[PDB]
Amino acid sequence: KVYYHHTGHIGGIKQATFEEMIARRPERVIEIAVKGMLPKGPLGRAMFRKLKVYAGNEHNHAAQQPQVLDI
Amino acid sequence: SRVAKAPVVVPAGVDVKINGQVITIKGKNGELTRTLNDAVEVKHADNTLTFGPRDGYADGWAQAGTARALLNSMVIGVTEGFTKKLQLVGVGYRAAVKGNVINLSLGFSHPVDHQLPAGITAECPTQTEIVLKGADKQVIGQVAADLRAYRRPEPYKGKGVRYADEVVRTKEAKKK
Amino acid sequence: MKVRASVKKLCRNCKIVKRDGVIRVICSAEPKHKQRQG
Amino acid sequence: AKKVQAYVKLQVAAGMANPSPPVGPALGQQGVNIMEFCKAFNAKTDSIEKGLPIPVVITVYADRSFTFVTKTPPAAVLLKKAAGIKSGSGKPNKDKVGKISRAQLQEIAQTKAADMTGADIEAMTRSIEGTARSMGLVVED
Amino acid sequence: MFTINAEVRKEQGKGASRRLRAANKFPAIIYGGKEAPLAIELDHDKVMNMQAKAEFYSEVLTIVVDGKEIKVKAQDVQRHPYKPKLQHIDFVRA
Amino acid sequence: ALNLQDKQAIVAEVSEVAKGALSAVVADSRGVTVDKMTELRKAGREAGVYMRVVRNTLLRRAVEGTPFECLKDAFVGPTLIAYSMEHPGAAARLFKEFAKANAKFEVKAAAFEGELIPASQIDRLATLPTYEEAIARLMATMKEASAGKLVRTLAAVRDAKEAA
RNA sequence: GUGAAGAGGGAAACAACCCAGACCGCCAGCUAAGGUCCCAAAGUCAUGGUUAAGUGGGAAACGAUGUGGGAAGGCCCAGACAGCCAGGAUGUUGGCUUAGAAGCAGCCAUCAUUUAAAGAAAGCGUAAUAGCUCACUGGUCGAGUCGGCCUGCGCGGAAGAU
RNA sequence: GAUGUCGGCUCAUCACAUCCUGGGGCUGAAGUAGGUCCCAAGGGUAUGGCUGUUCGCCAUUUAAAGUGGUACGCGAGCUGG
């Protein structure tokens, strides 16, 4: 699992292992895991902007009184 | 499968502490002796270790023999201690311990900084003779294994650090 | 090691053992037998 | 492995184990000092004819002290003398360089009797048959 | 040597034989003498792993069906085009 | 079933000779070592002793199908069994012939005419006076009991009454 | 047959494929092929078997002590299987070859002998002799194991202009 | 009712089946060196001549003188042999 991209430069694919992506900047494994689950352009941007992950275990969301949900 | 059927019957005075799947073997004359059984479920009884299938795996007897082997090796490590005297052939190489550190030369311009895991201790009578002491059968060979990283018994003239069983065997040119 | 395909028994101690999805010939007579893949 | 074997093999002429080449390398390789063996073999060789190579089978302890059985000359030396042959054919069965009767064979077999383990003087004879066969003597009834 | 069983054929035709082979059963007949051929169904892997010994064919067979026993020896074998598996075997009274 | 008869036959074969033996002797080696065994077969044909080397699986199944005397505790661990139905002293002599290039503590026990003979005692049976020397010790024993003991006691009560 | 002379459903969709043959309208309902975690309409479906490869969900030659089940069968506590240890002998360091030439440098013999027992040797090995594992024998050893065959599942072979 | 060419220059780009350093197995490899040999697309990757020349030959550099594709890349960039 190496998260394939070609943003625009240099011969080759460029890559990053799932482990680098969870150990450093940990948001992104789960971020580009839900990305492909939402439709096309406009509706898929509109569904996405409601979510936040931050880095992990550093949340600021005490004051709203969050409703717990188990998966 | 016959060595998965061995009831072990652990010795008197070895402390085998069971958290269900995690087992910690303690006693005198070594440190840091443990197993995480993850493929197989291990019940202790009072001392008769019994091996069977774990949730989310399908292979059988295959790690149950390993559990037997690995738990009993550990038990045997704390009781008598498995042989401790290790040694190397080839002039000018060495493995002289000075404290927690193993001093050797490889012609390198840096200090090699080869050092012991926390799960072993060592001392040396002579610069080519090393005695590693502990009660985990895996660790004593894991530091040997790193010592061997660039000093394997060579396949021609055989020089290297020599210990226990090793799967390079040495070979000859065709017979004279 | 040479990469190859299909593993055969070169000497009476070629055990032949499956490490990952590739079968290694590992022998304990001669170091000469290490075919990496099967 | 102790690296111990009973009945390690040697063949050296009864007056020539004073030099090392007639003993060859093997003895040295299992660590029996050649002079010490030479003195001990000389004490037991006087009823044996000199220069006839005697097989001697040694059993060895840990500390490399050694014990030795000395034997009457090979069935192959005796068979060469009795057939009027210097040497064997160098091919078994196909090549003939002579012939042997049973009565010359039963006496070769008694000359080995105290070394031969067999329970019958016929079994002992039977054992030396394939030694005549190898050297191009036909064993005739 | 072998003591086996058989059933008499419920269904005949091509359409009928193929639903037995879907179920890992196969057919037979015992011919010879003055008397009729007894058409029968067998179980496939009952005789496949017997016929691993050469004794299924070298020695006669006890085949009991509706309590009738006549004694029999194997005859010529029909096998599937590209599998050794038995499509049909013939038998003669012995 | 077995592929061969050798393992099942030998159980019957060992019980047969070993009830019958007037002496047999059960001794230890786990690899009897060839120089000595062949030297014990060489001599064995002089003396008329027979020797089999035999597994504790066979010896246990033998005790189970057939009753044995005074050897069936010495079958435990690695075992040779040498046995004689004739000249019982010679069976025991064979162990002093094996003791010469090898160890004498290896006997666990023996039986001799239904008697248990313990490991230490059998070195004495193997000493084996000849018939003239046997008659002569039977006389020393009777001349001892006759006149030697007689004076031995009367001196020992005379010393004791004499007071200091 | 379908398109040509056809809507609508599914397929990453096309001209032809699988369903099917658009009268128009109805915030009606069912069923088809094709679907049923999100994308996206419905099953993270229940029951039993099985696998470590994202195999599944990309193809052949070919091969192997990768992995499981099965019935029929040999071995199968009278002790397997074969690991671990220990013996591995008597003529014999057989003949030739050689300083020695020893099962294993090369070649021919390829056996016989006391044996409860050890091939004049399968494989290794100072290049060779020496030592070594190996059945078989005797300690440990007290249960599965192997050939045939049916069968679920795996493997590498399968490296490219973006 | 048209994607318009070779050789060369300019400017590049992507596949690794890597020209090379680098890590490492085998070797009938003593060590060195080579043969054998797996990983790897990151970076650097020479120049004058003759011919219309792809291809050729020669002189020379470089530790070294690579492999493949782009309307036979690239005239809504350059030539008219």
From Swiss-Prot, chain B:
Complex and partners: Part of the 50S ribosomal subunit.
PROSITE patterns cross-referenced by the UniProt entry: RIBOSOMAL_L6_1
InterPro entries assigned to the protein according to its UniProt record, in alphabetical order: Ribosomal_uL6-like, Ribosomal_uL6-like_a/b-dom_sf, Ribosomal_uL6_a/b-dom, Ribosomal_uL6_bac-type, Ribosomal_uL6_CS
Function: This protein binds directly to at least 2 domains of the 23S ribosomal RNA, thus is important in its secondary structure. It is located near the subunit interface in the base of the L7/L12 stalk, and near the tRNA binding site of the peptidyltransferase center. Gentamicin-resistant mutations in this protein affect translation fidelity.
Molecular function, one GO term: structural constituent of ribosome
N6-acetyllysine carried by residues: 43
Protein name: Large ribosomal subunit protein uL6
HAMAP family to which the protein is assigned, alphabetical: Ribosomal_uL6_B
Pfam families linked: Ribosomal_L6
GO cellular component terms given for this protein: cytoplasm; cytosol; cytosolic large ribosomal subunit
Family: Belongs to the universal ribosomal protein uL6 family.
GO biological process entries: cytoplasmic translation; response to antibiotic; ribosomal large subunit assembly
Keyword flag Ribosomal protein: yes
Keywords: Acetylation, Antibiotic resistance, Ribonucleoprotein, Ribosomal protein, RNA-binding, rRNA-binding
Keyword Signal: no
Swiss-Prot record, chain C:
Listed PROSITE patterns: RIBOSOMAL_L36
Alphabetical list of Pfam families matching this protein: Ribosomal_L36
Signal peptide limits: none
Superkingdom: Bacteria
Keywords annotated in UniProt: Ribonucleoprotein, Ribosomal protein, RNA-binding, rRNA-binding
Disulfide bonds: none
GO biological process terms on file: cytoplasmic translation; translation
UniProt xrefs under InterPro entries: Ribosomal_bL36, Ribosomal_bL36_sp
A Gene Ontology cellular-component term: cytosolic large ribosomal subunit
GO MF entries: rRNA binding; structural constituent of ribosome
Functional description taken from the UniProt entry: One of the last ribosomal proteins to be assembled in the 50S subunit, it contacts a number of helices in the 23S rRNA, acting as molecular glue. The simultaneous presence of uL16 and bL36 probably triggers ObgE's GTPase activity and eventual dissociation from the mature 50S ribosomal subunit.
Subunit record text: Part of the 50S ribosomal subunit.
Family to which this protein belongs: Belongs to the bacterial ribosomal protein bL36 family.
HAMAP family xref list: Ribosomal_bL36 (MF_00251)
Protein name per Swiss-Prot or TrEMBL: Large ribosomal subunit protein bL36A
Organism: Escherichia coli (strain K12)
From Swiss-Prot, chain E:
Record-linked NCBIfam families: PRK05943.1
Protein name: Large ribosomal subunit protein bL25
Pfam families: Ribosomal_L25p
Keywords: Ribonucleoprotein, Ribosomal protein, RNA-binding, rRNA-binding
Function: This is one of the proteins that binds to the 5S RNA in the ribosome where it forms part of the central protuberance. Binds to the 5S rRNA independently of L5 and L18. Not required for binding of the 5S rRNA/L5/L18 subcomplex to 23S rRNA.
Native organism taxonomy: Bacteria, Pseudomonadati, Pseudomonadota, Gammaproteobacteria, Enterobacterales
Gene Ontology biological-process annotations: cytoplasmic translation; negative regulation of translation; response to radiation; ribosomal large subunit assembly; translation
GO MF: 5S rRNA binding; structural constituent of ribosome
Subunit structure as annotated in this protein's UniProt entry: Part of the 50S ribosomal subunit; part of the 5S rRNA/L5/L18/L25 subcomplex. Contacts the 5S rRNA.
UniProtKB/Swiss-Prot annotation, chain F:
Keyword match Ribosomal protein: yes
Matching PROSITE patterns: RIBOSOMAL_L10 (PS01109)
InterPro entries to which the protein is assigned, alphabetical: Ribosomal_uL10, Ribosomal_uL10-like_sf, Ribosomal_uL10_bac, Ribosomal_uL10_bac_type, Ribosomal_uL10_CS_bac
Source domain of life: Bacteria
Gene3D superfamilies assigned: 3.30.70.1730, 6.10.250.2350
Annotated CDD domains: Ribosomal_L10
Keyword Acetylation annotated: yes
Molecular-function annotations in GO: large ribosomal subunit rRNA binding; ribosome binding; structural constituent of ribosome
Pfam families reported for this sequence: Ribosomal_L10 (PF00466)
Residues bearing PTM N6-acetyllysine: 36, 104
Keyword tags: Acetylation, Repressor, Ribonucleoprotein, Ribosomal protein, RNA-binding, rRNA-binding, Translation regulation
Cellular component GO terms, alphabetical: cytoplasm; cytosol; cytosolic large ribosomal subunit; large ribosomal subunit
GO biological process, one term: negative regulation of translation
Other known facts: Ribosomal protein L8 appears to be an aggregate of ribosomal proteins L7/L12 and L10.
Role, per record: Forms part of the ribosomal stalk, playing a central role in the interaction of the ribosome with GTP-bound translation factors.
UniProt record similarity statement: Belongs to the universal ribosomal protein uL10 family.
Summary of subunit composition and partner proteins: Part of the ribosomal stalk of the 50S ribosomal subunit. The N-terminus interacts with L11 and the large rRNA to form the base of the stalk. The C-terminus forms an elongated spine to which 2 L12 dimers bind in a sequential fashion forming a pentameric L10(L12)(L12)2 complex. Two L12 dimers associate with a copy of L10 to form a very strong complex (called L8).
Protein name in the entry: Large ribosomal subunit protein uL10
Species for this entry: Escherichia coli (strain K12)
